[PDB]
Design a protein around this ligand. Structure first.
Ligand SMILES: Fc1ccc(Cn2cnc3ccccc32)cc1
Length: 291
């Protein structure tokens, strides 16, 4: 799977909010482009002269993520974050010359991402009470991965001492994205666990944090809630469910070619961190069938 790379796999079956630190610093921002940020401003002006209803928004930038030694006490992960924007994204990661910016970043900074906006996305492996994961079908009319299968998620917007408020907004945002798109009540959702971080090599390496969330509703109840919003309550065009039993071998199915890279990241991390049992009982042949 060349279009996705794992940056982080979390230990302990995934990390709760209380075990993560963020460091928000202008040191973690994109570097100004070799020939000036005028190239970004020109792309944005061109785009507004065709679609004058578009608006900019701030985004978190992922710089790096350091895991503590496994089995230790205290905070288990440090996220190094800066600030970027939708405009900077459209001028760098989504530019036709994005590969040239990666090579120049390696040359100038020893960092393929130094000239890239790299806005941090969030996604969820969302499990139902009857042991299915939730999938969404993307519109065929959007710019990114048209007509492909996705999981719930988005790109959260800004507003350990500013750090703890940023970690809170990351965890809050994946629940809010589930409520907005799947039309579920907030009280049917567990506190998320961070599974890891995956990069989309089709979008010049921009990263998404992938989370596990459990819902107290069955697949049939989740479908009812999604459909009862009507066509205007969701950006997706359909919902469907796969038994967690069958998610284990999803990369061997015909579904795998229809999954967008960030959803592939969510499913690989779910299989490595929530699946793949380590103990004698769940590891026994009848419960973990060989091959
Ligand atoms: F920081 C962000 C990163 C991606 C999106 C998703 N999105 C929205 N409009 C897009 C146009 C081209 C490609 C992707 C796009 C939003 C914010």
């Amino acid at each position: 799977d060349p279009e996705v790379t794992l940056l982080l796999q979390c230990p302990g079956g995934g990390l709760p909010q209380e075990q993560i630190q963020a460091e928000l610093s202008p040191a973690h921002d994109r570097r100004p482009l070799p020939g000036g940020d005028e190239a970004i401003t020109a792309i944005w002006e061109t785009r507004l002269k065709a679609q004058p209803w578009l608006f900019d928004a701030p985004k978190f930038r992922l710089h790096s993520a350091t895991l503590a030694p496994i089995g230790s006490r205290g905070p288990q992960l440090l996220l190094r974050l800066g600030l970027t924007s939708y405009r900077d994204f459209l001028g760098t990661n989504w530019s036709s010359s994005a590969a040239w910016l990666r090579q120049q970043g390696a040359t100038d900074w020893g960092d393929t991402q130094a000239y890239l906006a790299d806005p941090l996305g969030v996604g969820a492996a969302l499990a139902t009470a009857d042991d299915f994961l939730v999938f969404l079908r993307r519109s065929r009319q959007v710019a990114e991965a048209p007509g492909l299968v996705d999981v719930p998620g988005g790109h959260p917007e800004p507003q350990d001492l500013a750090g703890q408020l940023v970690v809170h907004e990351l965890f809050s945002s994946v629940l809010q994205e589930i409520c907005d798109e799947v039309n579920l009540p907030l009280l049917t959702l567990s506190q998320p666990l961070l599974l890891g971080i995956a990069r989309n090599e089709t979008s010049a390496g921009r990263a998404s944090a992938e989370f596990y969330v459990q819902c107290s509703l069955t697949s049939e109840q989740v479908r009812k809630h999604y459909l009862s919003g009507g066509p205007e309550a969701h950006e997706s065009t359909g919902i469907f469910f796969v038994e967690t039993q069958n998610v284990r071998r999803l990369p061997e199915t015909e579904m795998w070619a229809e999954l967008c890279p960030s959803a592939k990241g969510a499913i690989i991390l779910y299989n490595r961190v929530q699946g793949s049992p380590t103990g004698a009982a769940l590891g026994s042949p009848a419960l973990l069938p060989p091959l």
